[PDB]
Amino acid sequence: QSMSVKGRIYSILKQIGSGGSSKVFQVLNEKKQIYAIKYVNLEEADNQTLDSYRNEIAYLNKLQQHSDKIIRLYDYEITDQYIYMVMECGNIDLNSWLKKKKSIDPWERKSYWKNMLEAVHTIHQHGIVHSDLKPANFLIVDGMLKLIDFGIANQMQPDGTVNYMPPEAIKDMKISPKSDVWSLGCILYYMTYGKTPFQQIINQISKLHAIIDPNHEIEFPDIPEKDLQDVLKCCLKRDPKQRISIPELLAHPYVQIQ
- Interface of this chain with its own copies, residues 54 to 113, rule: CB under 8 A: none
- What minimum distance in Å lies between the beta carbon of 147 and ligand 5NW? 10
Binding-site member from 158, 194, 247, 253 for ligand 5NW (CB under 6 A): 158
- Per-residue H/E/C for the chain: CEEEECCEEEEEEEEEEECCCEEEEEEECCCCCEEEEEEEECCCCCHHHHHHHHHHHHHHHHHCCCCCCECCEEEEEECCCEEEEEECCCCEEHHHHHHHCCCCCHHHHHHHHHHHHHHHHHHHHCCCCCCCCCHHHEEECCCCEEECCCCCCCCCEECCCCCCCCHHHHHCCCCCHHHHHHHHHHHHHHHHHCCCCCCCCCCHHHHHHHHHCCCCCCCCCCCCCHHHHHHHHHHCCCCCCCCCCHHHHCCCHHHHCC
Would you mind telling me the total number of residues written for the chain in this entry?
258
Asked if 136 touches ligand 5NW (CB under 6 A), the answer is yes
- Per-residue H/E/C for 193-220: HCCCCCCCCCCHHHHHHHHHCCCCCCCC
* Site size toward its own copies, by CB under 8 A: 25
- What minimum distance in Å lies between the beta carbon of 39 and ligand 5NW? 11
Binding-site member from 10, 21, 27, 36 for ligand 5NW (CB under 6 A): 36
Catalytic-role residue among 75, 93, 132, 149: 132
**Is 19 annotated in some ligand binding site?**
yes
- Interface of this chain with its own copies, residues 24 to 53, rule: CB under 8 A: none
Asked if 55 touches ligand 5NW (CB under 6 A), the answer is no
- The radius of gyration of the chain's CA atoms, rounded to the nearest angstrom, is 19
* Site size toward ligand 5NW, by CB under 6 A: 18
**Is 22 annotated in some ligand binding site?**
yes
Nearer to ligand 5NW, 27 or 117 (CB): 27
- Interface of this chain with ligand 5NW, residues 58 to 87, rule: CB under 6 A: 87
Asked if 93 touches ligand 5NW (CB under 6 A), the answer is yes
**Is 17 annotated in some ligand binding site?**
yes
- Interface of this chain with its own copies, residues 143 to 182, rule: CB under 8 A: 151, 154-155, 160-163, 165, 169-171, 173, 175
Binding-site member from 18, 61, 204, 256 for its own copies (CB under 8 A): 204
Annotated catalytic residue 132: yes
What is the spatial distance between Cα 152 and Cα 119, in angstroms, rounded to a whole number? Answer: 15
Query: Residue 253's CB: how many other CB atoms inside 10 A?
Result: 12
Binding residues for its own copies, rule: CB under 8 A, are: 20, 131-132, 151, 154-155, 160-163, 165, 169-171, 173, 175, 200, 202-205, 207-209, 212
Give the footprint of ligand 5NW on this chain (CB under 6 A). 16-17, 24, 26, 36, 38, 87, 89-90, 92-93, 96, 136, 139, 148, 156-158
Which residues line the annotated binding site for ATP? 16-24, 38
